[PDB]
Amino acid sequence: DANSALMELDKGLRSGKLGEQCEAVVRFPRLFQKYPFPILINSAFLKLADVFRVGNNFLRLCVLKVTQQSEKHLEKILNVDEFVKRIFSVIHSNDPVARAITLRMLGSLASIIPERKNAHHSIRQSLDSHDNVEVEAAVFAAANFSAQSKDFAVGICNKISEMIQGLATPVDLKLKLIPILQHMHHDAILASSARQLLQQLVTSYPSTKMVIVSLHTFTLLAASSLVDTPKQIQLLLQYLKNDPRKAVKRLAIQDLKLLANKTPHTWSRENIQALCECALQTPYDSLKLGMLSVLSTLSGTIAIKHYFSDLVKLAQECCYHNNRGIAAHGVRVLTNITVSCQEKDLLALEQDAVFGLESLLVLCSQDDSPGAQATLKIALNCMVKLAKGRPHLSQSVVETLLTQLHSAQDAARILMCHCLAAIAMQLPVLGDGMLGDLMELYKVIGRSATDKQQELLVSLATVIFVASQKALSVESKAVIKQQLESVSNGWTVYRIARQASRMGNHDMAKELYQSLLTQVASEHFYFWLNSLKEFSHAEQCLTGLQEENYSSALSCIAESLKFYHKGIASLTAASTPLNPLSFQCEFVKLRIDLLQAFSQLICTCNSLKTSPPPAIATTIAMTLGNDLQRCGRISNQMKQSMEEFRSLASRYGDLYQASFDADSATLRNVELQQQSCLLISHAIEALILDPESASFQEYGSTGTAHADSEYERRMMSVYNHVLEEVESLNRKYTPVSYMHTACLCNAIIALLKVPLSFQRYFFQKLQSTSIKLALSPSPRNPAEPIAVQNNQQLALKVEGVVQHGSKPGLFRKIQSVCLNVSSTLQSKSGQDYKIPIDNMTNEMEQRVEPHNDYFSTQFLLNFAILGTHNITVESSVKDANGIVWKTGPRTTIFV
């Protein structure tokens, strides 16, 4: 399809038709974005060079704009010499505008040709030309070619020095020539020369714009060359303490902010003390605000740990200031000092912390302005950090939040509810204590609300579900009453049900899904809601289990499995090629298989009493048997259960690496499920069977204070209980499983206590990344295999492009693509499989690291079979830490 577009663009560019030519040129970037293939990009860039060589001086500007726009698609050009020659063939003209456009184009290409001496000579010659636009274009190209190309930097530094110090150029030309010195970080001598030049320029050209631009260049050089950053900080502090202008002070403040953002470890105690002394002597508010912002940025890193008493006094003084931003920065500094540092007297500061938070709550409660909401969010995330890094003051902040919830005109209560939900994820006693007040607010909030009643109700329901644990009391009926006669917004109640299913409340989820099943404006969403309702019903019926019960447990398991089958059927009935549901189907199917394995296990444990000893005793005496102790027919069932659990754990590990887009919570939930499955497998392998097989004691710590959810803590406690009950009964009784089946069934029931936790990735699937993997084999439009001599060779020439529908750097980053290739026989040779060896020796596991969004490897294979074969390839993207991340593109070609 791209060939037709290239052909039509060529036909449009053939005739003159200046309008049509400009149209084609400005449409070329869309063709680049649609097809990132290297051959098409190379051909299009060659055609652009052709139309740039001869033109009416206006197509050249459009081609320059296209080149400046499509910069990432520039390194994937095969023919570079001819392109550069066609671009440079127009710089010898006498037209200054044409030469300026050519210089700007060359500067835009400074990432693919950093060693072409002709371009360096042209920039050197046209830098001191008698013009106005050509000089600016030469300056731009010189900056671009001085970014890279250390040789060009050492060749242009002296010329820039003379052109700046020649006192024969206007102030604007010097202001434009100064930022060229930023790219002098190639050698120590270059850095020293640029530093001396900038010092001389500051001491000899005292002016607002001049000093501003020179200091910006100097700090960019110091930040790109981390050799003299303390001297930079000292100079900035000296200019903050001495220079009386206001613009230079704000420039130095933003400079220190950038330095703390990028390189915070180079700071010392003297620099912080000097900055605090300068902030204490500032009579203005914006300057003190910027200095405190720099201090807050610094205190969030190891600088606050290396500093450890002026910063503490400054933070205590600016915590109760009149303005809100300064107080927010002060309380942020105080919270960071409390969390990071662990001094003795600083404990008292904790008081000054919590009450200080109140100073940020009574001023941004009913203000309704972004300037107040920013400080409110700052204080709220600071309180979250203080509560998650120090549980000693977890109640002293939640009580203030509860008391302040009554002092908002339905504007800040959403943020307070978000803060409460984020804090309650660690300790459930806060939710146990504040559930009553949350229900009181939910009851008194249903009076009247129009502006943002939807989000407010959603946040209230979310924090209530987080605080609650059962949601089976009158509170559920009260929430239903408050949501029924009020506005029946489908999205609000849908989000409420989603949060209820996420937190584990399944009764409210089932009620809301039943209420939403009757109002669906389509068919796919109807099946989705029906599947959610069936899953919630099966979850609720799963909780209907009693401790030490085995009669009704089988009926509950059977009805839950029936509801799960109905739900997965209604869900796969909604699976469409457009936006397919792959994670949900697999997750539900694996949950169903796990529960079926548990049902088989409990059925075998119950049938163990159905005359199992005398069953296999007719062929061999099972009593006192050294070969197979207590040999019975139950051994086959135990082995089947063990292999089923092993396959389930393998499928869990596969599903973990098959998503690549799940959040931390969903990955942790999958890991916990696989851990429970492996624990049940270890219990059925080491306890029910012979204990002399492994006999490995779990003498190690577990369940550290790092779980960010109550479900994870409950799962870890159940794991610890199972381990402590299995480590003691290992060598107690005979392996006929007299008391081992009892504790096994108790562990099975304990694992079924927590119903489930549908994590965030189950809905709103974001970060949709995909590798195209469009190889370039011989032309094969039909399904007929490529005619090969079967003896010479067979090439692949595989190449793939990554495509991210959402923000790439959100959760994980693509670093390596472990391309794999295999071959097998299609036709049956002797058996149902390919052959005795299937010709799967040719693997060639290659590990390519694509620097840009493109990669290309070379694959081969040698086969001497006159039949038809099958060639398949896999992406297997690798992240930064390093995980297989088995993707499922499944690109299969016959020959």
Of the candidate residues 1, 4, 16, 167, the single one contacting other proteins (CB under 8 A):
167
For the CB of residue 507, give the shortest distance to other proteins in the complex, in Å. 31
- Of 87 and 319, the one with the shorter C-beta distance to other proteins is 319
Hey, which residues between 847 and 876 contact other proteins (CB under 8 A)? 858-860, 862
Task: Based on the shown chain and the rule CB under 8 A, indicate whether residue 13 belongs to the binding site for other proteins.
Answer: no
What is the pairing mode between strands 846-848 and 802-804? unpaired
Query: By CB under 8 A, is residue 569 in contact with other proteins?
Result: no
Q: In this chain, which of 23, 50, 75, 725 binds other proteins, going by CB under 8 A?
A: 23
Question: How many angstroms separate the Cα of 402 from the Cα of each of 126, 378, 438, 570, 592?
Answer: 70, 18, 8, 43, 42
Candidates 155-163, 242-250, 570-578, 829-837; binding stretch for other proteins (CB under 8 A):
242-250
Please report whether residue 261 would count as binding other proteins according to CB under 8 A.
Answer: no
CB closer to other proteins out of 609 and 851:
851
Of 695-724, binders to other proteins (CB under 8 A) are: 695-704, 706, 716, 719-720, 723
Q: Which of residues 607-666 bind other proteins (CB under 8 A)?
A: 649, 652-653, 656-657
Q: Give the interface segment with other proteins, choosing from 498-506, 593-601, 629-637, 881-889 (CB under 8 A).
A: 881-889
Token representation of residue 274: 């000097």
CA distances from 806 to 582, 661, 803, 810 (A): 18, 11, 9, 8
CA distance 513 to 794: 56
> What whole-number distance in Å separates Cα of residue 333 and Cα of residue 43?
57
Q: How far is the CB of 543 from other proteins (least distance, A)?
A: 25
The residue within the footprint of other proteins, chosen from 3, 7, 8, 18 (CB under 8 A), is 18
Q: Which of 78, 18, 85 is nearest to 49 (CA)?
A: 85
Select from 258, 393, 766, 795 the one that contacts other proteins (CB under 8 A): 795
Contacts to other proteins from residues 28-47, by CB under 8 A: 29-30
User: Taking the CA of residue 77 as centre, how many other CA atoms within 13 Å lie in the half-sphere pointing to its CB?
Assistant: 26
Q: Considering the complex, what minimum distance in angstroms separates the CB of residue 418 from other proteins?
A: 21
Judged by CB under 8 A, which stretch of 40-48, 377-385, 729-737, 840-848 contacts other proteins? 840-848
| Cβ closest to other proteins, residue 469 vs residue 846 | 846
**Interface with other proteins (CB under 8 A), residue from 844, 848, 865, 893:** 844
**Please, which residue, 526 or 885, has the CB nearer to other proteins?**
885
Give the tokens for residue 143.
């900056």
Is there binding between residue 352 and other proteins (CB under 8 A)? yes
C-alpha neighbours within 13 Å on the C-beta side of residue 6: 17
Residue 168 Cβ vs other proteins, minimum distance, rounded to whole Å:
4
Per the CB < 8 A criterion, the answer to whether 427 and 394 are in contact is yes
Residue whose CB is less far from other proteins, 491 or 699: 699
Taking the complex as a whole, the smallest distance from the CB of residue 11 to other proteins amounts, in Å, to 15
Task: Please report whether residue 675 would count as binding other proteins according to CB under 8 A.
Answer: yes
- Identify residues 51-90 at the interface with other proteins (CB under 8 A): 57-58, 60-61, 69
The angle subtended at Cα 557 by Cα 553 and Cα 559, nearest 5°, is 115
Which of 478, 678, 742, 865 touches other proteins by CB under 8 A?
678
Residue 313 C-beta: closest distance to other proteins, Å: 8
Which positions from 196 through 215 interact with other proteins, judged by CB under 8 A? 203-213
Query: Hey, which residues between 286 and 305 contact other proteins (CB under 8 A)?
Result: 286, 301-302, 305
Give Rg (Cα) of the chain: 35
Chain breaks in the chain (C to N over 2.5 A) after: 308
Amino acid code (one letter) for 869: H
Are 419 and 401 in contact by the 8 Å Cβ rule? The answer is: yes
How many residues touch other proteins under the rule CB under 8 A: the total is 153
Contact pick of 73, 120, 186, 834 for other proteins (by CB under 8 A): 186
* Smallest distance, other proteins to C-beta of residue 481, A: 30
Cβ of residue 251: shortest distance to other proteins, in angstroms? 6
**Cβ–Cβ under 8 Å, residues 467 and 401:** no
Question: Should residue 242 be labelled a site residue for other proteins when binding is judged by CB under 8 A?
Answer: yes
Cβ atoms of 836 and 811 within 8 Å: the answer is no
- Identify which of residues 409 and 549 has a Cβ nearer to other proteins in the complex: 409
Q: Are 331 and 295 in contact (CB under 8 A)?
A: no
Phi-psi region of 504 (alpha: psi -120 to 50; beta: other; left: phi over 0): left
Distance of alpha carbon 435 from alpha carbon 446, whole angstroms: 17
Residue of 41, 119, 163, 180 that binds other proteins (CB under 8 A): 180
155/356 with CB nearer other proteins: 356
CB of 621 to other proteins, least distance (A): 29
Retrieve residue 135's tokens.
């000089």
Site for other proteins contains 811 (CB under 8 A): no
The 392-421 contact track toward other proteins, x by CB under 8 A, reads -------xx--x--xx--------------
- Here the contacts of 701-708 (C-beta below 8 Å, separation 24 or greater) are 708/425, 708/426, 708/665
- Output 523 or 643, the one with its CB closest to other proteins: 643
42, 234, 261, 340: residue in contact with other proteins (rule CB under 8 A): 340
Q: Which stretch binds other proteins (CB under 8 A): 525-533, 555-563, 610-618, 842-850?
A: 842-850
779: phi > 0 → left, psi -120 to 50 → alpha, else beta; which? beta
Among 89, 193, 261, 263, binds other proteins (CB under 8 A): 263
The region that residue 615 occupies, defined by phi over 0 for left and psi between -120 and 50 for alpha, beta otherwise, is alpha
Which residues lie below 8 Å from residue 197, measured CB to CB, with a gap of 6+? 161, 164, 181
Between 406 and 562, whose beta carbon lies closer to other proteins?
406
CB of 227 to other proteins, least distance (A): 6
Q: Which of 7, 54, 362, 480 binds other proteins (CB under 8 A)?
A: 362
DSSP secondary structure string for all residues of 543-611: T---TT--HHHHHHHHHHHHHHHHHHHHHHTT--SSS---HHHHHHHHHHHHHHHHHHHHHHHHHTTSS
Contact 327, 320 (CB under 8 A): yes
